[PDB]
Structure formats: C-alpha cells, structure tokens
Amino acid sequence: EVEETLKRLQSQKGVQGIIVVNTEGIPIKSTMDNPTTTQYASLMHSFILKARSTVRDIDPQNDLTFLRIRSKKNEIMVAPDKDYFLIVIQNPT
C-alpha cells in the first residue's frame, strides 16, 4: 500500500525529503532530490553500515529503530529498523 505510505510520509508537515535507503543504497523511491541524494544515500549506506557494525558489535543487544538526527540546521528524523533507514530531512521550527 504505497497510498497511505507515501501519503503519511510526504504529507507530514515540514518534511523536506525522506530517503528510503535499501541495501542497494539508492533512494529511487523517496521525496528527496534524487540526482543529489542518490550518491549521498549510497555513501551514507556504507557509513551507516559502519554505524550498524559499531552499535551492534560493541553492544550486540542494541538495534537501531529511530535515528533522530538533531543537527544545527535540519531535523533528519530517520526511521529505521533492520530493513531500512528512512533518512528524512525535515524543516525545524
């Protein structure tokens, strides 16, 4: 059901752009600017793989289900699990 999914994903207020990065590392199905975030999400796929190894090898009983990236300029409130990492850059206010 891509209707309710994309609906509640991009329809959410201030959501600039989500990145549904799969194992492939390419956000072809997302609401970010694909020609700019394709390589971004691929590089971040490798480094988030580094982060998965870190968080899951030092403390193996700690998964990664929600990454509230509180930056100085954007609310990248990523929504992960063991399957994806919804890297979503969202408007702060």
Q: Let me know if 34 is exposed, middle or buried by CB neighbors in 10 A (0-12, 13-18, 19+).
A: middle
What's the closest the beta carbon of residue 51 comes to another protein, in angstroms? 18
Which secondary structure element, helix H or strand E, spans residue 17, and what is its range? strand 15-17
Break-preceding residues in the chain (C–N over 2.5 Å): none
The residue (of 57 and 82) whose beta carbon lies closer to another protein is 82
Tell me the closest approach of the beta carbon of residue 5 to another protein, in angstroms: 4
| The two structure tokens encoding residue 28 | 């072809």
| Distance of closest approach, residue 87 Cβ to another protein, in angstroms | 11
Residues contributing to the site for another protein (CB under 8 A): 1-2, 4-5, 8-9, 12-15, 20, 22, 28-29, 65-66, 68, 70-75, 77, 79, 81, 83-84, 86, 88, 90, 92-93
